[PDB]
Design a protein around this ligand. Structure first.
Ligand SMILES: Nc1nc2cc(Br)ccc2s1
Lengths: 215, 213
C-alpha cells in the first residue's frame, strides 16, 4: 500500500488520477492519492503564495513560508519528497522502479518561476528529497509532470534498453497493407528474431543514444 | 489559430486542458482543444478498441480499422498527427517550438503496447506523422504524455495559456529556518549577480545533468 500526496495551487488539474491506471490502482486499494490546495496553508486574505525574486529576473517565485507549513503537516521523516522541475535529475524507468517500493511520496508542484530553493534544502534536513525532470521541455507548472510520475510509478507497484518495434493485429490485410508474413507464420524462433531486429532497427533510427551512438 | 484534437478512450483525462485555457484566448480564436472518445468509431456492440497481437505475446494492440476511421474523420492534409509512445523520437523543447506554429495537431492516445503500425504508416501517406516519447519511462497509455505535449506547445503560443540548467531562486523573507538568501543577490551589483548565477548553473548542470556538457 502506497500513499501519494500532491500539493498544488491547481488541485483540479490532478483529477485525471481518477481515470485509467491510477484510478484502477486506487479502487483496488493499492494506492491512496490525495490532492492538497497549497493555499490552505496561507494566512492572509489574499492567500498569496508568490513574491518577486531576489537578485532580479522575470516572474515570481513561490514563497518558502507557505510550502514549509504545508510540508510540515504532510511529510514525515519516511517521506520521499518529489519536486518536478526542468532543472532536476532525470526521472527514468529506473527511478520509477525505485519509487514503486516507497511507502509515501509527496509531490510538490511548482508554478510561476519555481519554488524558493530553501524549501527543498530545509526538507532535506529531515527527509529524502528528489528534484527531478521528466524530460527536456518546459511546462507552466509541475502538475502534468506529477501525473506522469504517478502513472510511471503506479504501473510498477506489486499488485498492479531498446525500443519496442511495431505491433499488429487483425485483419491480416488492411487498406492494401499486409501484416509482416513472419508474424502469421507461427514460427516462434523466426518471430522472436524478427521482433528483436525490428527493435534494434527502430532504436538506431529513433534513439541512437540508447545504443551508444551520437545524437 | 491552433486547433488540437485529442482521441482517447479516456476523454475525461483531458479535461484539465480545456480548464487550463483562458477565456480570452478562446474568444480571440487563438486556440481550440477538442477531445474525442475513440469508441465513437468502434464497429461492434462491444465497442472493441483492441485485439490480440499477431505473432503472440502479452497485452493487446489497438485495432487499425477503428483508428483508421477516427483519423479519416478528424484529420486533413494539413494535420500534424502526433502519436505519443515510449518507442518514439524524443519530444523536446525544440519540438514544442516547431509544433507551436502548426494549424492543426491531432494527438492519438493509445496503450503503450501500441496502435497497429499500419495506422501511422497509412496516415503518413497523406499527412505528417510524428511518433514521440516524452521521456525514458513507460506509461500505460498516451494520455498523460498528451497533457505534457499540449501544455509545452500551447505555452509557446502568444496569449494562449496566460544548454545549462537554471540555478536556485529565492524570495522573501531574507532569512528562513536558519537559511539566508545568498547575500550577493541583495548586493545591487548586477554584473556580479549574473556571474554568480552562471556559476550556480554550471555546478548544478555538472551535478545533475553531465550529459549536457
Ligand atoms: N518540465 C517541467 N516544467 C516545470 C515548470 C514549473 Br514552473 C514547475 C515544474 C516543472 S517540470
Amino acid at each position: 500500500s502506497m500513499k501519494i500526496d500532491v500539493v498544488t495551487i491547481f488541485p483540479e488539474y490532478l483529477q485525471p488520477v481518477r481515470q485509467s491506471l491510477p484510478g484502477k490502482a486506487i479502487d483496488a486499494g493499492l494506492v491512496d492519492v490525495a490532492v492538497h490546495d497549497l493555499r490552505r496553508w496561507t494566512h492572509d486574505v489574499h492567500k498569496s503564495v508568490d513574491d518577486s525574486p531576489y537578485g532580479g529576473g522575470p516572474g515570481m517565485v513561490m514563497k518558502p513560508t507557505v510550502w514549509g507549513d504545508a510540508l510540515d503537516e504532510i511529510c514525515t521523516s519516511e517521506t520521499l519528497l518529489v519536486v518536478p522541475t526542468p532543472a532536476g535529475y532525470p526521472f527514468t524507468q529506473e527511478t520509477a522502479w525505485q519509487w514503486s517500493t516507497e511507502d509515501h511520496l509527496v509531490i510538490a508542484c511548482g508554478r510561476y518561476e519555481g519554488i524558493d530553493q530553501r524549501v527543498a534544502d530545509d526538507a532535506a534536513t529531515r527527509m529524502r528529497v528528489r528534484e527531478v525532470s521528466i524530460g527536456d521541455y518546459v511546462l507552466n507548472g509541475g502538475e502534468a509532470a506529477a501525473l506522469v510520475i504517478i502513472e510511471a510509478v503506479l504501473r510498477l507497484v506489486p499488485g498492479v534498453s531498446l525500443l519496442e518495434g511495431p505491433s499488429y493485429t487483425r485483419p491480416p490485410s488492411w487498406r492494401g497493407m499486409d501484416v509482416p508474413p513472419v508474424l502469421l507464420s507461427g514460427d516462434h524462433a523466426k518471430i522472436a528474431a524478427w521482433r528483436a531486429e525490428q527493435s534494434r532497427q527502430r532504436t538506431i533510427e529513433r534513439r541512437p543514444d540508447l545504443l551508444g551512438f551520437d545524437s
